[PDB]
């Protein structure tokens, strides 16, 4: 994460999208509290629960947790970064969101 932060904006320097956005509205929550608790991004420097590997059943969008990041020696502007998506034998990746825009347009 620290190595990757060098090649990012000042914001989103140490951040990651929440794996699960909506979790379920029951009698344990109220409307205001339930819809205020839902978060979009979490800081990785103080959230050890954001480094757990999720498990996905069906087609769902999940963020990638970096586990390696390093550049080439004679080409320092070429950087290899490894993101661990999901757990177990998955069928495959349907699409990749490079930023907020998927490679395959809508």
């Amino acid at each position: 994460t620290t190595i990757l932060a060098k090649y990012q904006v000042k914001e989103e320097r140490y951040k990651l999208q929440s794996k699960k956005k909506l979790f379920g509205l029951s009698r344990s929550y109220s409307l205001k509290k339930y819809y205020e608790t839902v978060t979009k991004e979490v800081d990785l420097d103080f959230n050890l629960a954001a480094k757990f590997i999720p498990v996905v059943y069906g087609v769902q969008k999940i963020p990638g947790i970096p586990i390696f990041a390093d550049t080439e020696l004679n080409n320092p502007n070429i950087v290899y970064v490894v993101y661990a998506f999901a757990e177990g034998e998955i069928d495959g990746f349907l699409d990749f969101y490079i930023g907020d825009s998927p490679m395959i347009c809508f």
Partner: protein, 106 residues
């Protein structure tokens, strides 16, 4: 990284999900693709010692679970398959097929 993409954007992906074991009434075992059925997903989560509780398949009546899965596999006739244009990204694999189960979970 070059003159144009000066920063590494946040990477997210749309996975298809972990493959699950779908038990059939006759006795054969089919685990080649992920399943949207809730009972099979719960059975995968409950019989995995890597993530979750390690409940062996011995402590499970296969016939009852198979019969209860078909309850969630009942075809719904309220809507038409043509009405979903994002068929590939809602868990379906072939628009020609039925894909109209009463309860489908991603």
């Amino acid at each position: 990284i070059n003159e144009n993409r000066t920063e590494i954007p946040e990477i997210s992906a749309e996975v298809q999900g972990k493959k699950v074991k779908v038990y059939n009434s006759d006795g054969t075992i089919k685990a080649d693709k992920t399943s949207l059925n809730g009972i099979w997903q719960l059975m995968d989560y409950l019989t995995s010692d890597r993530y979750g509780a390690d409940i062996t398949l011995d402590q499970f009546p296969l016939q009852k679970v198979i019969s209860e899965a078909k309850i969630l596999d009942i075809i719904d006739e309220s809507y038409q398959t043509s009405w979903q244009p994002y068929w590939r990204y809602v868990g379906w694999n072939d628009p020609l097929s039925e894909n109209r189960q009463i309860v489908q979970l991603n």
